[PDB]
Amino acid sequence: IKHVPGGGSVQIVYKPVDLSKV
Amino acid sequence: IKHVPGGGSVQIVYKPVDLSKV
Amino acid sequence: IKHVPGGGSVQIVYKPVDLSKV
Amino acid sequence: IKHVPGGGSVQIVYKPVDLSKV
Amino acid sequence: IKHVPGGGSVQIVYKPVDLSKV
Amino acid sequence: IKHVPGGGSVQIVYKPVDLSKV
């Protein structure tokens, strides 16, 4: 019995710029 | 019995700039 | 920006019995 | 931007019995 | 920016019994 | 019995700049 969700994962975000207004 | 969620994960964010206004 | 691998994950094992021989 | 691999994932095993020989 | 691997995860094992022999 | 959430994790943020206004 094993449970192994989301293993070995990568995310990359390159040069993001945020100009949001609130 | 094992539970091994999210193992080995990477995140990269490269040169982010935040100019947000509140 | 979020990364959430294996997030919110569940395992349930109910009344397991082990009689293994080695 | 979200990344959520294996998110919300479930396993259930009910009354397992192990009789393995080694 | 957040990274949250395995976040919010649960395991339950209910009334396990071990009679293993070596 | 093991529970092993989020093991082996890396995060990298490279040369971030924060100019946020409140």
Resolution (A): 2.9
Q: Answer yes or no: do C20 and E21 touch at CB < 8 A.
A: yes
Three-state SS for D4-17 is CCCCCCEEEEECCE
CB of C11 closer than 8 Å to CB of E10: yes
Q: Which of F21, A16, F6, B17 is nearest to D1 (CA)?
A: A16
DSSP state of D21: B
Q: Answer yes or no: do F14 and B10 touch at CB < 8 A.
A: no
D21-to-D14, E3, E15, E20, E22 alpha-carbon distances in Å: 22, 43, 23, 10, 10
Q: Is A15 on the interface with C (CB under 8 A)?
A: no
SS3 D22: coil
Q: Is D13 on the interface with A (CB under 8 A)?
A: yes
- Report how this structure was experimentally obtained: cryo-EM
CB of F16 closer than 8 Å to CB of B13: yes
The rounded distance, in Å, linking the Cα atoms of C15 and A8 is 31
